[PDB]
Amino acid sequence: ETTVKIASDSSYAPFEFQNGQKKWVGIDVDIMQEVAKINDWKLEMSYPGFDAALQNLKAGQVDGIIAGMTITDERKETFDFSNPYYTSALTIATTKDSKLSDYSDLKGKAVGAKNGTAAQTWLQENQKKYGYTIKTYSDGVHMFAALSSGNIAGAMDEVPVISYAMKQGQDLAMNFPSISLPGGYGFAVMKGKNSTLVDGFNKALAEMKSNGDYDKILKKYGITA
Amino acid sequence: ETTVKIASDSSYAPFEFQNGQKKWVGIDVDIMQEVAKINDWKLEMSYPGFDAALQNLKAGQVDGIIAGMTITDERKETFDFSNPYYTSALTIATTKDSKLSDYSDLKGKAVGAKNGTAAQTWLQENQKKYGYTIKTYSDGVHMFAALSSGNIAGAMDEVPVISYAMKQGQDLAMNFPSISLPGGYGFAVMKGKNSTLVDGFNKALAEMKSNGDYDKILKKYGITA
Ligand SMILES: NC(=[NH2+])NCCC[C@H](N)C(=O)O
Ligand SMILES: NC(=[NH2+])NCCC[C@H](N)C(=O)O
Ligand code: NA
């Protein structure tokens, strides 16, 4: 009944990614599809990439974005957000048999993050305090390979990313604290616009938490912390 | 197996509280029981109240504390902590049919909080910014009854506490932004003592986060990790 165009990232597991059949799957895909059905929306998903999705949203070529997008006060100056649909935390992953548990245990060790991330910033801000060296990576495939090889002692990323990788059978544990960003992940529209879409998102999310569909989706993608 | 004596609060749902059959339950209870099992400890829980628990810990009558205890610099002068096992936050609960969605909407409205809480402090610190009046309550039963009756327009409390109240079927919604409580909640021992207990807690938490048991426990009380 109402056509709703949503843009998303092209590859950001477990939020949105293609499986082996090239079907779009992930937490964001499954949530958005169920929200649309609850609200009687005809959903038209596109996957141009995070940056392109933002460009398209601002130009009015799409109506909203869901793309592992952390809610921040700066972003709220441009966008209106839903209630968060998942908590947004960071953590340092280790290999499965690692006994590292505390930040002081990284002294003298190398710790990875992806270039241009909150994780990179945290590591930079805490390097002198705990005495590790930092290694920067292009993507998760390279960072986690380095962790499994022992070339780094830890890899800092978003908790859902590490959880998914773990569920897939990667050699990983979550031995360190979760560092919370308060915003959570949100559905976004342009500021002042499409408040009915945000409200339908909010109402559907509440129903899904209530009826257990929300928890089914998280467990499908191995999201446990 | 060695006996481990742990003290907690007497009523802090959903962390520790007595249910309808008068059984001690909650996130802290379930986590501590699973940590003990993982570590082959015989756990002896007591529930004298937070302040009594600190007294008992300082006197050597118990070995540790779990009681939604914020990790703070002040506290770290007396106590050693585990990695935080949960990071709480503050937000405004409204009735389910309330249309309020942001702090600016509270101008000219009465907003409640419990006496002697972070929520109260936050409200007092932000009153001039948003322009509400503050009403103080002894406990949750009283604050939430005032909200349901329309005598207050919102109630400031912790996300986990509101989440559980909603699970129990109270007429509540969480449509406002959250305010992070720096530190997270940790397991505590006397400074320099009982390193075995802190290490056992850290390693067991990592296993429970890694194997899904941590998530299952939160979900039982309506909380998303
Ligand atoms: N699909 C994505 N890469 N989304 C952005 C992920 C990084 C971070 N959560 C952010 O909001 O900036
Ligand atoms: N009944 C309660 N709400 N107890 C709260 C006391 C613990 C509080 N989070 C603190 O760290 O000081
Ligand atoms: Na906290």
Numbering used by the authors:
A (entry chain B), B (entry chain A): 27 to 251
Task: Give the authors' words.
The adenosine triphosphate (ATP)-binding cassette (ABC) importer GlnPQ from Lactococcus lactis has two sequential covalently linked substrate-binding domains (SBDs), which capture the substrates and deliver them to the translocon. GlnPQ is an ABC transporter involved in the uptake of glutamine, glutamic acid, and asparagine and was found to be a robust model protein to study the mechanism of substrate delivery from SBDs to the translocon. SBDs operate in a Venus-fly trap mechanism, where the binding site for a substrate is located between two lobes of an SBD, which is connected by two antiparallel β-strands (the hinge region). We report three high-resolution structures of SBD1, namely, the wild-type SBD1 with bound asparagine or arginine, and E184D SBD1 with glutamine bound.
In addition, arginine binds in the substrate pocket but is not transported by GlnPQ. The effect of nontransported substrates on substrate affinity was shown using FRET measurements, where arginine, histidine, and lysine can competitively inhibit the uptake of glutamine (via SBD1 and SBD2) and asparagine (via SBD1).35 To investigate this inhibitory effect, we aimed to obtain the crystal structure of arginine bound to SBD1. Unfortunately, we failed to obtain well-diffracting SBD1-Arg crystals; hence, we soaked crystals of the unliganded SBD1 with 10 mM arginine. In the obtained crystal structure, there are two molecules of SBD1 in the asymmetric unit cell, which show a slightly different binding pattern of arginine. Most interactions are with the large subdomain and the carboxyl-side chain of E184, which makes a hydrogen bond to the α-amino group of the Arg. Similar to the binding of the high-affinity substrate asparagine, the α-carboxyl group of arginine is stabilized by a salt bridge with R101 and hydrogen bonds to the backbone nitrogen and the hydroxyl group of T96. Clearly, the bound arginine traps SBD1 in a conformation that is unable to close, hence explaining the inability of GlnPQ to transport arginine leading to the inhibition of the transport of Gln and Asn. It is also notable that this binding does not affect the global rearrangement of the protein structure. Furthermore, partial domain closure has also been demonstrated for ligand-binding domains of ionotropic glutamate receptors iGluRs. Together with the fact that also in solution arginine prevents closure of SBD1,35 we believe that our observation that arginine is incapable of triggering the conformational change is correct. The presence of l-arginine and l-histidine at the binding site leads to the inability of SBDs to close fully hence leading to the loss of transport activity of the transporter.
